[PDB]
Design a protein around this ligand. Structure first.
Ligand SMILES: *[C@@H]1O[C@H](CO)[C@@H](O[C@@H]2O[C@H](CO)[C@@H](O)[C@H](O)[C@H]2NC(C)=O)[C@H](O)[C@H]1NC(C)=O
Ligand SMILES: *[C@@H]1O[C@H](CO)[C@@H](O[C@@H]2O[C@H](CO)[C@@H](O)[C@H](O)[C@H]2NC(C)=O)[C@H](O)[C@H]1NC(C)=O
Ligand SMILES: *[C@@H]1O[C@H](CO)[C@@H](O)[C@H](O)[C@H]1NC(C)=O
Ligand SMILES: *[C@@H]1O[C@H](CO)[C@@H](O)[C@H](O)[C@H]1NC(C)=O
Ligand SMILES: *[C@@H]1O[C@H](CO)[C@@H](O)[C@H](O)[C@H]1NC(C)=O
Ligand SMILES: *[C@@H]1O[C@H](CO)[C@@H](O)[C@H](O)[C@H]1NC(C)=O
Ligand SMILES: *[C@@H]1O[C@H](CO)[C@@H](O)[C@H](O)[C@H]1NC(C)=O
Ligand SMILES: *[C@@H]1O[C@H](CO)[C@@H](O)[C@H](O)[C@H]1NC(C)=O
Ligand SMILES: *[C@@H]1O[C@H](CO)[C@@H](O)[C@H](O)[C@H]1NC(C)=O
Ligand SMILES: *[C@@H]1O[C@H](CO)[C@@H](O)[C@H](O)[C@H]1NC(C)=O
Lengths: 219, 49, 46, 46, 164
């Protein structure tokens, strides 16, 4: 299936506060009214320039992503996981199952079978959006958690995404995947292009509205 | 100063812009994130075995 | 003004208008507003 | 109480010009940055 | 090695640590510390917050950033606020007073007395009389109204009477 975003995938493109103004930016955005894939419950996707990624549930079936160029050994990759404990970022050379996942006893993690040469570690319904990008050896992640009053369909509205993480890795990326918690006892993928937007800033400094300046003559 | 900026030993009545003025910085300050991970080389240079 | 001396064969490009180097930063400097000639010729036979 | 466009236009023109003057303090014109404290920090005087 | 405490030097055990700095091709990594200083308010200073470099006078403010926002800027894109990275407090930035200086002369063919106007400057930062055109030094403020002689501005004029 395919679906239509309406006004989705807007993130704060810098750390700068702004009071009641209209500011114009050039960056990598998800164009308004786009053609976003639909997935149910998954396969190896491309990256090619950033990614928008939403998801919907009350349980937690979406348990992180895996990135990289080959998703195996012989080249390095990232791995972002969340068991019922908390997030586990990790950067080694792995050996990934071609269909990697984790179970739910509640024993799991048939994800990889190798953790060699680790160069970075870290340990510690609902709509959960994420924007992933990778520039100059930094892997930036923006995110937002809005509550839907549906269960698993893409809604309409405006909600800007706030920066979360910054990782000075150096890693090359060309592909990525997803991770799901099996049954033993809905998600979308947009892509980002270089656009020019007009963001409206509140008096507290939040982005409340935007204009995509390449949609139509009025814009 | 008027005679210099007017290039003349006589000046006529009026008001004349002669120079600018500005306050100079008293000192310098520097701010930066706090200190947390300063590397504990007291594990490799301070091992028991 | 004739300034006459002897250097190592490498830092002959260190006698130039405007530069950084261990010979130029410590033992001899020329202004960036230099005007004149620089002559160098080899010497281990003297 | 419910037309002064000729007075509004001369105000607008002057403000639009003064803003364009300040917005030019952030162009390179073919330099490495727009800040003098950045050319005086990663370049030698020559 | 059979090490024994009664061994001549050069046969006693030495511990060795070899540090090897490498530079692959990442974006950055570990570096050395960097001394700093405290903070002062209400004085023209040269500040530096994390790389934000400028000069001016810092006061405390009534803004509220967003937890991830590190400094503010206004229309025309000048920095007019900042967050300092240790208190987590935001501070207003105001340029350090400046202006023009004008001298009021009654004509050198009449006198050598002068008055001085410091344009749009408060009088504290330089008998002494505060106009809306700036701070005026060397002229007496009388209460009568004459025709204008030398225009000061915002309704004020000056003149050489009687002698002053
Ligand atoms: C290993 O740990 C010891 C103890 O904490 C450090 O020894 C200190 O060295 C300083 C400077 O020589 C002395 O003033 C202190 O008196 C020492 N400690 C004690 C408890 O007396 C030593 O510096 C550490 N090694 C390294 C490489 O950091
Ligand atoms: C930075 O470190 C200092 C201490 O080195 C922290 O200062 C404390 O701040 C709290 C307020 O939250 C005060 O109640 C304490 O009295 C302060 N102690 C000292 C010794 O100054 C400061 O909070 C730290 N800030 C950050 C952002 O880490
Ligand atoms: C998205 O692109 C596919 C490509 O064939 C097309 O079939 C589909 O109709 C498009 N969806 C929308 C909403 O335009
Ligand atoms: C969650 O997964 C990480 C991945 O290595 C692991 O380190 C951690 O121990 C797991 N949680 C528990 C409770 O074992
Ligand atoms: C990465 O792992 C392989 C196999 O374990 C090893 O041959 C190689 O030396 C490792 N890389 C580095 C930089 O040591
Ligand atoms: C990423 O892959 C490209 C392939 O064209 C390669 O040239 C580049 O060096 C790689 N990145 C790094 C940091 O080596
Ligand atoms: C945030 O904005 C709202 C409306 O714009 C305003 O009423 C409020 O005072 C602001 N500050 C808050 C909520 O701290
Ligand atoms: C200027 O001075 C000369 C010489 O004393 C005099 O003749 C002339 O009247 C003066 N001009 C005036 C008073 O306007
Ligand atoms: C000048 O400074 C004084 C001293 O704080 C202040 O009270 C006053 O409002 C300022 N402005 C004028 C026009 O006096
Ligand atoms: C000018 O007149 C006012 C009347 O309100 C008075 O308060 C003030 O002291 C007078 N100043 C002088 C210098 O006479």
């Amino acid at each position: 299936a395919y679906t239509n975003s309406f006004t989705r995938g807007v993130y704060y493109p810098d750390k700068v506060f702004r009071s009641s103004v209209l500011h114009s930016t050039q960056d990598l955005f998800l164009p308004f009214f786009s053609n976003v894939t639909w997935f149910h419950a998954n396969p190896v996707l491309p990256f090619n320039d950033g990614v928008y990624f939403a998801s919907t549930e009350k349980s937690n079936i979406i348990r992180g992503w895996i990135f990289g160029t080959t998703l195996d050994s012989k080249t390095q990759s990232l791995l972002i996981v969340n068991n019922a404990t908390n997030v586990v970022i990790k950067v080694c050379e792995f050996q990934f199952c071609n269909d990697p996942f984790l179970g739910v006893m509640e024993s799991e993690f048939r994800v990889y079978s190798s953790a060699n040469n680790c160069t970075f570690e870290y340990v510690s319904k609902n709509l959960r959006e994420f924007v992933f990008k990778n520039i100059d050896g930094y892997f930036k992640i923006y995110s937002k958690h809005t509550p839907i009053n549906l269960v698993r369909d893409l809604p309409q509205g405006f909600s800007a995404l706030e920066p979360l993480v910054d990782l000075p890795i150096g890693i090359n990326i060309t592909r990525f995947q997803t991770l799901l918690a099996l049954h033993r006892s809905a998600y979308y993928v947009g892509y980002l292009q270089p656009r020019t937007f007009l963001l409206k800033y509140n008096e507290n400094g939040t982005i409340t509205d935007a204009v995509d300046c390449a949609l139509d003559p009025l814009s | 100063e008027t005679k210099c900026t007017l290039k003349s030993f006589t000046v006529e009545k009026g008001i004349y812009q002669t120079s600018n003025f500005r306050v100079q910085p008293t000192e310098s300050i520097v701010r930066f994130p706090n200190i947390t991970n300063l590397c504990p080389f007291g594990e490799v240079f301070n091992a028991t075995r | 003004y004739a300034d006459s001396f002897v250097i190592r064969g490498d830092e002959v490009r260190q006698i130039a208008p405007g530069q950084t180097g261990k010979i130029a930063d410590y033992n001899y400097k020329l202004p960036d507003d230099f005007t004149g000639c620089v002559i160098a010729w080899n010497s281990n036979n003297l | 109480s419910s037309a002064l466009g000729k007075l509004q236009d001369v105000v607008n023109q002057n403000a639009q010009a003064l803003n364009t003057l300040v917005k030019q303090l952030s162009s390179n014109f073919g330099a490495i940055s727009s800040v003098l404290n950045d050319i005086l920090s990663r370049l030698d005087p020559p | 090695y059979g090490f024994q405490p009664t061994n001549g030097v050069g046969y006693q055990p030495y511990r060795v640590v070899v540090l090897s700095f490498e530079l692959l091709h990442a974006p950055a990594t570990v570096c050395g510390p960097k001394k700093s200083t405290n903070l002062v308010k209400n004085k023209c200073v040269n500040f530096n917050f994390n790389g934000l470099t400028g000069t001016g006078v810092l006061t405390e403010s009534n803004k509220k950033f967003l937890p991830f926002q590190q400094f503010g800027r206004d229309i025309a894109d000048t920095t007019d606020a900042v967050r300092d990275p240790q208190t987590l407090e935001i501070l207003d930035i105001t340029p350090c007073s400046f202006g023009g200086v004008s001298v009021i002369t009654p004509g050198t063919n009449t006198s050598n007395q002068v008055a001085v106007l410091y344009q749009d400057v408060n009088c504290t930062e330089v008998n002494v009389f505060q106009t809306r055109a700036g701070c005026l030094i060397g002229a007496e403020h009388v209460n009568n109204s004459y025709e204008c002689d030398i225009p000061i501005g915002a309704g004020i004029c000056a003149s050489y009477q009687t002698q002053s």
